Swiss-Prot record, chain C:
Record text on cofactor binding: P700 is a chlorophyll a/chlorophyll a' dimer, A0 is one or more chlorophyll a, A1 is one or both phylloquinones and FX is a shared 4Fe-4S iron-sulfur center.
UniProt topology in membrane: Multi-pass membrane protein
Single Gene Ontology MF annotation: magnesium ion binding
UniProt keywords, alphabetically: 4Fe-4S, Chlorophyll, Chloroplast, Chromophore, Electron transport, Iron, Iron-sulfur, Magnesium, Membrane, Metal-binding, Oxidoreductase, Photosynthesis, Photosystem I, Plastid, Thylakoid, Transmembrane, Transmembrane helix, Transport
Protein name, UniProt field: Photosystem I P700 chlorophyll a apoprotein A1
Localization terms from the record: Plastid, Chloroplast thylakoid membrane
Binding site residues for [4Fe-4S] cluster: 553, 562
EC number: 1.97.1.12
Lineage top rank: taxon: Eukaryota
Family: Belongs to the PsaA/PsaB family.
Function field: PsaA and PsaB bind P700, the primary electron donor of photosystem I (PSI), as well as the electron acceptors A0, A1 and FX. PSI is a plastocyanin-ferredoxin oxidoreductase, converting photonic excitation into a charge separation, which transfers an electron from the donor P700 chlorophyll pair to the spectroscopically characterized acceptors A0, A1, FX, FA and FB in turn. Oxidized P700 is reduced on the lumenal side of the thylakoid membrane by plastocyanin.
Chain sites annotated for binding phylloquinone: 672
Swiss-Prot record, chain D:
Catalytic activity line of the entry: reduced [plastocyanin] + hnu + oxidized [2Fe-2S]-[ferredoxin] = oxidized [plastocyanin] + reduced [2Fe-2S]-[ferredoxin]
Cofactor note: Binds 2 [4Fe-4S] clusters. Cluster 2 is most probably the spectroscopically characterized electron acceptor FA and cluster 1 is most probably FB.
Membrane topology: Peripheral membrane protein
This protein's name: Photosystem I iron-sulfur center
Protein function: Apoprotein for the two 4Fe-4S centers FA and FB of photosystem I (PSI); essential for photochemical activity. FB is the terminal electron acceptor of PSI, donating electrons to ferredoxin. The C-terminus interacts with PsaA/B/D and helps assemble the protein into the PSI complex. Required for binding of PsaD and PsaE to PSI. PSI is a plastocyanin-ferredoxin oxidoreductase, converting photonic excitation into a charge separation, which transfers an electron from the donor P700 chlorophyll pair to the spectroscopically characterized acceptors A0, A1, FX, FA and FB in turn.
Organism annotation: Pisum sativum (Garden pea)
Swiss-Prot record, chain F:
Shown residues within the full chain: 540 to 734 of 734
Protein name: Photosystem I P700 chlorophyll a apoprotein A2
Signal peptide segment: none
Compartments reported by the entry: Plastid, Chloroplast thylakoid membrane
Natural source organism: Pisum sativum (Garden pea)
Entry function: PsaA and PsaB bind P700, the primary electron donor of photosystem I (PSI), as well as the electron acceptors A0, A1 and FX. PSI is a plastocyanin-ferredoxin oxidoreductase, converting photonic excitation into a charge separation, which transfers an electron from the donor P700 chlorophyll pair to the spectroscopically characterized acceptors A0, A1, FX, FA and FB in turn. Oxidized P700 is reduced on the lumenal side of the thylakoid membrane by plastocyanin.
Gene that specifies this protein: psaB
Length: 161, 69, 730, 81, 138, 195
């Protein structure tokens, strides 16, 4: 009922701010994002890696196969993996040497669940390095790979119009 | 005071959190190793860096016939 | 102070050493204060704590300006009468190339003054009276010499009303701080009773006295001087004595008429101003509104009303203050006055409102760039003065908790966005061009962005322009063509040397300039917005409003702590706008001549001052000095020994003054001190210095002498560059 | 040094003279008289940023003061954050 | 944060105030006396009404509390406290410590002032080029 | 007086690059012996320009040469632009020229690379760390606040460049542009010729 929730700016204290509002926090947005890392960690990553790798994968095709350097290609290759498959490699390790910001190094192991987590204090890290690996390892097999059922597909395609 | 949609209605109520979705698509370990080389790593990643980048660059240029600049 | 207070000196103070801030100018001597005081001659922290007068001063300063325009332009209208050019031109227009102004021949001077004319040596003019002017029908040189003194009348009097305030014992609070009427009046009967009154002297007299001028004669072969009342036979032509209507209304019959009016749309042929006859109707149809409109009303009433959930409580009593801020009710205004001047700058060039413009090229682009720098020089201001609000004006807090207090609530936010906006632009809004170079210099056009190469394919044509002319599907009735001739549909046919006005169709290469404008308009505003918003307190300084909107910079710490403030956001925001406008100008003339400005020739084969070089070649940003700066400008650096020459001969100075600014812009301050003493030493040996402690420039004065010079430098450079490539071919 | 900009003077009296500065300065130590006899250049300075608001007012009668630590904190920066 | 509201001091929301590295370093909350409820300026673009107490709002960085302080003694009162919080409680305890109101004596603390030598003629350059035998490290 | 003066008596033990000092006293600034060196390098980039400028125009004209031309056209300032500077860019400016690309393209693109590197000096030079740092204070409320951008830690905290640094960088920027423009200018014109 309350003019917008029991009317609060933030979670409650005003003072951090973020002026929590729609597009910050509406039952409708907020939800379109929790198997995914925004709030909770669904599973120990390893898997999120490829839905991340892959979805972002078959992107970067018409960007560099329809806007390519000398464009609209007559080659077997593009439509194409090509260079883009090269980008997921540069990308994916530009990605790794960031997982040298956190190492923090363990196996604990839980994608299995005890007791509704809370994480407890997930906010902030508590991702060890042996986590950020299995993500940016999922990234490679998500990038390269997610680059082929892009071109594998014939483009049945829609014409400008 | 009849009307009021007497506690109307609530939800339980206007909580949400406690089970909004079953979590994830099955795929369990349809990958698990499956491809190891980032699933193995300690230690790697040079190894790979010279490899990927050696092909990309190596065949990336040389030959067959020109097609020149 | 006390030379001698209150009651008991008429006797004026000239002398004993004089004034400001309480450890007042010391006694003991300095230089800076002579620079202080021209600056910040009015700020209004000082003179009185209590607004009291000042509103009682700013009415007087206003009077002075109104006079002054008047002193001006009597001058102008003089000049315009008795150094005539005008009588001669008007029989003669489209031959003439017109002056008001002549040198005297002393020393060099007189290269300058080169035959303009109906047979006299001149300096050619590009502000047009001679076009405001066409309107007077009656004519002759000695009058304008009456309109002239009529000017000096309004002045002396509209300048003894300024005696007749402040200095005279004079007024008090209520009179402004009860507003309740003020727009009521203003818009009703002046906004109205001018445009209204202007109607009455815009068909009465002007219409007829160019209705049969648009043929020739030697004037007065046409128009008697008073001629135009109880009389009128002459109205009969140009229409009826209403013959039998009554006070409009209807039980009226036309089998053939409808009152003067009769709307025009398009341009006159053989005077392509646009019809001198929609000019009455439109002004008439204005005034009414104003006539009805300035009849609101007394206030919070409307403002205190509607509220929303995002929307602002503040909206209400959105300002008891407003009546007495001032600095705020000027800042708002400048944005409008200012932003309502450069909307002139379009409707002008794509819809001339004076007889003989377009054909007259140079005498309405000067315009479109003068009017253009005000619809900009007055906008950055319109921020400065808000910053002047945002810091100081009210004694105390009691604005409270609104809409503003709202906007600020977010503030590392409204400006958090706007930022990315710009780097999205810039990358899509300039490196775009740089592609071309890097790849047309690499050279493979297949893949440029050329209007031909990257595919839209050869139409601009349909967006609005094509719906706009094409106009009468409509509830629209009217008038054979357009509101503006340029819009795509319609016509070959406009004018007699020359082309005046034609579609202008754009495509791409109108597409992306149009976008650089975006990014230029946007990062301008970022700095002013974030500037005026973070006015008083910041995440870097809290203790930030405490002297100043000015202070130099807080101090070497916090890392930088230099620019900050908001004099300086209104210092680096000018710096941009100088581009904002400086590149919009660069846009219009390269278009308006590459296409449009014309010639007609047998069978009308159009010959644009440049056969559309624009085509494939503005897109390259070198083409912008291949086709612009190095192409045109060849007329600036050829201009010696001539008549205009004063442009080529300026174009070096002021193309010097600019390259003097950097010295003021780029340098320290205890430097010219450290230097100023070596000096001061040599000075003392001969016994020639100390008294009035010679001092270096006041950190921010130094910035004041940047900027200001960087502009009157970098600007008149083109004022020269221009008048030198429309005078002479074009 | 790690904050070393000398504002010292000789009176170190602080009435209609100088106070301004975010935390840094507790002074009022005395030294065995100087007229007003509150002395020194400083209190312990590992707390706040780098103003020269430090003179601007009340004499230093040699150097002004200024930026100079070099050796620079974050808290001493303003930004980390 | 509902389950405990301790609050004394009254904004509503803002974009302003502390973002993450107040948790990961050093915390900085200021507290105060009040009479009868008044409407205030802030740090961070503005403003609120107070009432009473603890009257213990927390700020980002120390410049900000003191900054009111100027703020807080025009419109007056004696009493303003500012403390520094970690994550993990104490050391560095900021306004508490002896007296307050600098411009008093009990003690010295601090400061010196001179280093080794006084203001007069360092026309004299720096000297020996850093060796760990001679008193150049304070 | 790197050792220093009145406005600074002290100015020492960092003699060189201590750039800036607090406002007050008279107002004190680029008054380190570095920032006079900093200031110096503009006139070493103005002499070493008048001088070099000179040879070439002379030489140029000397080679299919009228000499005459320098002789009447050394004399005055305008038409130091007009011919030289305005004559004889001629060729280079189109290597691009819309109807396709002619022999020199490196040079003219360098010559505009020349006008950018230069111009973009000015920021550094009319900007002064204060304005930059502050909006980076708002612009580092983004991520910290905005999703899918978050947790995610810099190892180095965002900042705006110190208060000596940018007097350099605008310069070491002013210079390349400038020195990379004449580089590309003379060559891009003593190569076609006419001389
Ligand atoms: C309708 C509004 C108009 C009015 C009435 C005012 C009024 C005021 N402005 Mg203001 N301002 C305006 C428009 C206006 N402004 C605009 C459009 C801008 C943007 C540029 C500004 C930017 C601005 C700033 C930054 C400041 C003010 C300040 C002020 C206050 C100080 C006035 C003063 O001492 O004169 C100042 C005039 C001089 C000292 C004369 C010097 C003029 C030089 C620069 C010459 C200009 C170049 C010209 C080509 C030279 C003549 C030709 C020559 C070569 C022969 C005053 C209340 C000042 C303040 O502190 O607020 C209290 C503050 O300085 N204004
Ligand atoms: C030619 C100029 C140079 C450049 C490139 C810039 C660029 C910028 N200025 Mg700026 N400025 C300059 C000179 C320059 N300025 C000068 C001389 C002054 C004063 C004399 C200022 C005063 C000023 C102010 C007050 C402000 C700016 C702001 C900005 C930013 C606006 C946002 C934007 O669109 O940036 C991005 C786009 C560009 C920089 C242009 C495109 C660059 C091309 C060449 C692409 C290169 C990218 C490519 C991937 C290179 C990688 C290759 C590899 C070999 C390295 C932008 C960074 C404002 C800001 O930060 O707002 C966001 C702020 O308002 N400037
Ligand atoms: C003509 C071009 C080329 C080709 C063959 C494709 C083909 C494809 N793009 Mg694509 N794309 C291109 C250029 C191209 N793109 C360019 C230049 C961009 C600029 C960013 C994109 C940006 C883009 C995005 C963001 C996405 C795609 C998606 C897709 C795929 C899904 C088709 C669809 O609409 O969902 C069919 C949906 C249902 C049946 C339900 C498809 C394989 C994705 C997609 O289209 O999913 C909706 C994803 O949306 N593209
Ligand atoms: C709008 C501006 C203003 C400006 C810039 C000028 C500028 C000029 N006027 Mg002028 N004038 C003005 C208002 C102005 N006038 C007014 C209001 C009047 C009515 C009193 C006059 C009456 C007037 C006369 C009678 C003359 C000038 C002349 C001149 C020129 C001679 C220069 C001079 O005055 O000193 C030296 C010069 C171009 C002189 C001229 O045109 O001969 C070359 C001529 O002497 N003016
Ligand atoms: C406010 C405006 C302006 C002014 C001062 C005048 C003034 C005048 N008009 Mg007039 N007029 C105007 C706008 C104006 N007109 C416009 C816009 C139109 C056309 C839309 C006309 C169409 C018009 C006609 C047809 C006539 C006048 C006449 C007159 C004169 C006497 C009758 C009258 O209108 O008022 C005074 C009121 C009464 C006498 C009653 C008087 C000199 C008449 C005339 O010549 O003199 C009698 C008559 O010929 N006007
Ligand atoms: C934050 C407040 C509150 C809320 C929750 C809303 C919500 C809405 N307003 Mg709204 N409004 C408010 C206060 C509010 N308003 C206030 C105070 C005013 C006066 C200042 C308005 C003036 C206003 C107007 C003029 C409009 C809205 C519209 C809308 C709707 C957008 C259209 C849409 O999403 O469907 C579209 C979805 C499709 C699937 C199609 C949305 C339901 C728009 C509307 O009427 O709906 C389109 C319309 O533009 N509002
Ligand atoms: C009581 C009476 C009355 C009254 C009378 C009068 C007194 C009137 C008037 C009239 C009027 C009162 C008019 C007015 C008009 C105005 C106008 C018309 C305006 C103007 C202006 C201008 C022209 C300007 C311009 C400009 C611009 C645009 C901006 C800036 C620049 C310049 C300035 C150029 C009557 C009649 C009923 C009668 C009975 C009695
Ligand atoms: C030896 C000597 C000398 C010297 C001289 C010289 C060497 C000079 C120069 C000069 C230069 C080398 C430059 C300058 C320039 C100036 C100027 C330039 C001024 C002014 C201006 C104006 C008037 C303007 C106006 C305008 C406007 C209106 C706005 C914008 C545009 C323009 C700019 C157009 C003398 C004799 C003095 C003194 C004695 C000694
Ligand atoms: C521009 C110019 C000028 C001129 C001036 C004059 C001399 C004038 C004018 C103008 C005017 C002066 C106008 C007037 C007009 C008027 C009017 C527009 C009126 C209105 C209406 C009426 C008349 C009334 C009506 C009524 C009715 C409806 C019925 C009964 C009641 C009453 C009466 C209300 C001057 C010198 C400054 C110089 C510069 C240029
Ligand atoms: C500039 C690149 C061309 C691309 C646009 C071309 C499409 C439209 C055709 C030409 C446009 C110019 O329009 C022009 O047409 C004719 C030139 O042949 C001229 O035709 C005019 O001259 C003659 C005199 O009686 C007659 O043929 C026409 O009745 C008359 O309109 C006109 O001066 C002008 O109306
Ligand atoms: C060059 C320069 C100076 C030096 C400029 C000075 C000292 C200009 C002041 C010179 C005045 C205008 C000379 C006045 C003397 C005459 C008016 C007196 C005789 C009167 C006549 C009849 C000649 C600064 O002070 C400065 C300050 C801050 C940032 C940058 C700079 C900067 O770049
Ligand atoms: C833009 C700008 C900033 C902001 C700082 C910025 C924008 C740094 C931005 C990083 C750029 C994008 C890096 C690109 C440079 C590359 C050539 C990489 C450098 C490689 C080296 C190790 C040499 C300041 O801090 C500043 C301070 C004082 C005066 C003027 C200014 C100023 O103009
Ligand atoms: S000039 Fe002064 S205020 Fe400006 S940056 Fe330097 S030290 Fe700071
Ligand atoms: S500022 Fe100087 S004079 Fe004033 S108290 Fe401090 S040391 Fe003494
Ligand atoms: S500005 Fe200077 S004097 Fe003031 S607290 Fe900071 S370091 Fe100390």
């Amino acid at each position: 009922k309350p003019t917008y929730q029991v009317i609060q700016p933030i979670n409650g204290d005003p003072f951090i701010g973020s002026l929590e509002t729609p597009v910050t926090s509406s039952p409708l947005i907020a939800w379109y994002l929790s198997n995914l890392p925004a709030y909770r960690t669904a599973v120990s990553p390893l898997l999120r890696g490829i839905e991340v790798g892959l979805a972002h994968g078959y992107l970067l095709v018409g960007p560099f196969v329809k806007a390519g350097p000398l464009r609209n290609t007559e080659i077997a290759g593009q439509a194409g993996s090509l260079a883009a498959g090269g980008l997921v490699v540069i990308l994916s390790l530009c990605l790794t040497i960031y997982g040298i910001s956190s190492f923090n190094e363990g196996a604990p192991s839980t994608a299995p669940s005890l007791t509704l987590t809370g994480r407890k204090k997930e906010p902030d890290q508590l991702q060890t390095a042996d986590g950020w690996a299995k993500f940016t390892g999922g990234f490679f097999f998500g990038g390269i790979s997610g680059v082929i059922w892009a071109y594998f597909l014939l483009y049945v395609l829609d014409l400008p119009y | 005071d009849l009307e009021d949609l007497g506690n109307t209605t609530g939800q339980w109520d206007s909580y949400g959190s406690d089970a909004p979705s079953p979590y994830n698509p099955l795929q369990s370990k349809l990958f698990e190793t499956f491809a190891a080389p980032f699933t193995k790593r300690g230690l790697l990643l040079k190894f790979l860096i010279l490899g990927g980048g050696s092909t990309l660059a190596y065949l990336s240029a040389t030959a067959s016939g020109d097609i020149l600049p | 102070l006390v030379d001698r207070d209150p009651i008991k000196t008429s006797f004026e103070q000239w002398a004993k050493p004089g004034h400001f801030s309480r450890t007042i100018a010391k006694g003991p001597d300095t230089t800076t204060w002579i620079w202080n005081l021209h600056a910040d001659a009015h700020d209004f922290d000082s003179h009185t704590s209590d607004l009291e007068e000042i509103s009682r001063k700013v009415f007087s300063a206003h009077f002075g300006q109104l006079s002054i325009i008047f002193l001006w332009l009597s001058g102008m209208y003089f000049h315009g009468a008795r150094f005539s050019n005008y009588e001669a031109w008007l029989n003669d227009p489209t031959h003439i190339g017109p002056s008001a102004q002549v040198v005297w021949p002393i020393v060099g001077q007189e290269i300058l003054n080169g035959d303009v004319g109906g047979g006299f040596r001149g300096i050619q003019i590009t502000s047009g009276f001679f076009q405001i002017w066409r309107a007077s029908g009656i004519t002759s040189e000695l009058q304008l010499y009456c309109t002239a003194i009529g000017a000096l009348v309004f002045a002396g009097l509209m300048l003894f009303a300024g005696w007749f305030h402040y200095h005279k014992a004079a007024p008090k609070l209520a009179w402004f701080q009860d507003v309740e009427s003020m727009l009521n009046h203003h818009l009703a009967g002046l906004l109205g009773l001018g445009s209204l009154s202007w109607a009455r002297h815009q068909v009465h007299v002007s219409l007829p006295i160019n209705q049969f001028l648009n043929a020739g004669v030697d004037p007065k072969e046409i128009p008697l001087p008073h001629e135009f009342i109880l009389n009128r036979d002459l109205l009969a032509q140009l229409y009826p004595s209403f013959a039998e209507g009554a006070t409009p209304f209807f039980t009226l019959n036309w089998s053939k008429y409808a009152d003067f009016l009769t709307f025009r749309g398009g341009l006159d042929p053989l005077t392509g101003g646009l019809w001198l006859t929609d000019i009455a109707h439109h002004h008439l149809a204005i005034a009414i509104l104003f006539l009805i409109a300035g009849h609101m009303y007394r206030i919070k009433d409307i403002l205190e009303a509607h509220k929303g959930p995002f929307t602002g409580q503040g909206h209400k009593g959105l300002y008891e203050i407003l009546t007495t801020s001032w600095h705020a009710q000027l800042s708002i205004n400048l944005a409008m006055l200012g932003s309502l001047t450069i909307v002139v700058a379009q409707h002008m060039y794509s819809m001339p409102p004076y007889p003989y413009l377009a054909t007259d090229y140079a005498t309405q682009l000067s315009l479109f760039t003068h009017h253009m720098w005000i619809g900009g020089f007055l906008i950055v201001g319109a921020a400065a003065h808000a910053a002047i609000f945002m810091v100081r004006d009210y004694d105390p807090t009691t604005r409270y908790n609104d809409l503003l207090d709202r906007v600020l609530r977010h503030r590392d936010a409204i400006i958090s966005h706007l930022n990315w906006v710009c780097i999205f632009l810039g990358f899509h809004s300039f490196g775009l061009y740089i592609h071309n170079d890097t790849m047309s210099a690499l050279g493979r056009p297949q893949d440029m962005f050329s209007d031909t190469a990257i595919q839209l394919q050869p139409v601009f044509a349909q967006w609005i322009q094509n719906t706009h002319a094409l106009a009468p599907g409509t509830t629209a009735p009217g008038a054979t063509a357009s509101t503006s001739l340029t819009w795509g549909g319609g016509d070959l046919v406009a004018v007699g040397n020359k082309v005046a006005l034609l579609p202008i169709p754009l495509g791409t290469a109108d597409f992306l300039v149009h976008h650089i404008h975006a990014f230029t308009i946007h990062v301008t505003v970022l700095i002013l917005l974030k500037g005026v918003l973070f006015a008083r307190s910041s995440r870097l300084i809290p203790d930030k409003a405490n002297l100043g909107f000015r202070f130099p910079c807080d101090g070497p710490g916090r890392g930088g702590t230099c620019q900050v403030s908001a004099w300086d956001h209104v210092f680096l925001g000018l710096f941009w706008m100088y581009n904002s406008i400086s590149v919009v100008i660069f846009h219009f003339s390269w278009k308006m001549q590459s296409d449009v400005w014309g010639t007609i020739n047998d069978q009308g084969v159009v010959t644009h001052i440049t056969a559309g070089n624009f085509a494939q070649s503005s897109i390259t940003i070198n083409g912008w000095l291949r086709d612009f700066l190095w192409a045109q400008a060849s007329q600036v650096i050829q201009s010696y020994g001539s008549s205009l020459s004063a442009y080529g001969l300026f174009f070096l100075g002021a193309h010097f003054v600019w390259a003097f600014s950097l010295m003021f812009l780029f340098s320290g301050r205890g430097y010219w001190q450290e230097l100023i003493e070596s000096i001061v030493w040599a000075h003392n040996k001969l016994k020639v210095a100390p008294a009035t402690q010679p001092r270096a420039l006041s950190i921010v004065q130094g910035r004041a002498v940047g900027v200001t010079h960087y502009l009157l430098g970098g600007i008149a450079t083109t004022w020269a560059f221009f008048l030198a490539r429309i005078i002479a071919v074009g | 040094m790690s904050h070393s900009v000398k504002i010292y003077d000789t009176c170190i009296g602080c009435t209609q003279c100088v106070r301004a500065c975010p935390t840094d300065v507790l002074e009022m130590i005395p030294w065995g008289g100087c007229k007003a006899k509150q002395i020194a250049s400083a209190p312990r300075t590992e707390d706040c940023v780098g103003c020269k608001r430090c003179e601007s007012a009340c004499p230093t009668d040699f150097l002004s003061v200024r930026v100079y630590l070099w050796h620079e904190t974050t808290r001493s920066m303003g930004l980390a954050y | 944060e509902l389950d405990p509201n301790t609050p004394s001091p009254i904004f509503g929301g803002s974009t302003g105030g502390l973002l993450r590295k107040a948790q990961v370093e050093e915390f900085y909350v200021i507290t105060w006396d009040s009479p009868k409820e008044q409407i205030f300026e802030m740090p961070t673009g503005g403003a609120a009404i107070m009432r009473e107490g603890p009257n213990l709002l927390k700020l980002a960085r120390k410049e900000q509390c003191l900054a009111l302080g100027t703020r807080l003694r025009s419109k007056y009162k004696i009493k303003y406290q500012f403390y520094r919080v970690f994550p993990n409680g104490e050391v560095q305890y900021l306004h508490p410590k002896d007296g307050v109101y600098p411009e008093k004596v009990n003690a010295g603390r601090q400061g010196v002032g001179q280093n080794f030598r006084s203001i007069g003629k360092n026309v004299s350059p720096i000297e020996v080029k850093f060796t760990g035998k001679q008193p150049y490290d304070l | 007086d790197a050792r220093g003066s009145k406005l600074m008596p002290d100015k020492k033990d960092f003699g060189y690059s201590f750039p800036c000092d607090g406002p007050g006293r008279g107002g004190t600034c680029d008054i380190s012996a570095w920032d006079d060196f900093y200031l110096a390098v503009f006139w070493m980039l103005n002499t070493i320009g008048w001088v070099t400028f000179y040879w070439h125009w002379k030489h140029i004209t000397l080679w299919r040469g009228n000499v005459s031309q320098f002789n009447e056209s050394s004399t005055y300032l305008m038409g130091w632009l007009r011919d030289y500077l305005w004559l004889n860019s001629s060729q280079l400016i189109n290597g691009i020229t819309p109807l396709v690309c002619n022999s020199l393209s490196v040079w003219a693109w360098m010559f505009l690379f020349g006008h950018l590197v230069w111009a973009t000096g000015f920021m550094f030079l009319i900007s002064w760390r204060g304005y930059w740092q502050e909006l980076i204070e708002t612009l580092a409320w983004a991520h910290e606040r905005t999703p899918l951008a978050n947790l995610i830690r810099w190892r180095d905290k965002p900042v705006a460049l110190s208060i000596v640094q940018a007097r350099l960088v605008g310069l070491v920027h002013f210079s390349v542009g400038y020195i990379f423009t004449y580089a590309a200018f003379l060559i891009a014109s003593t190569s076609g010729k006419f001389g």
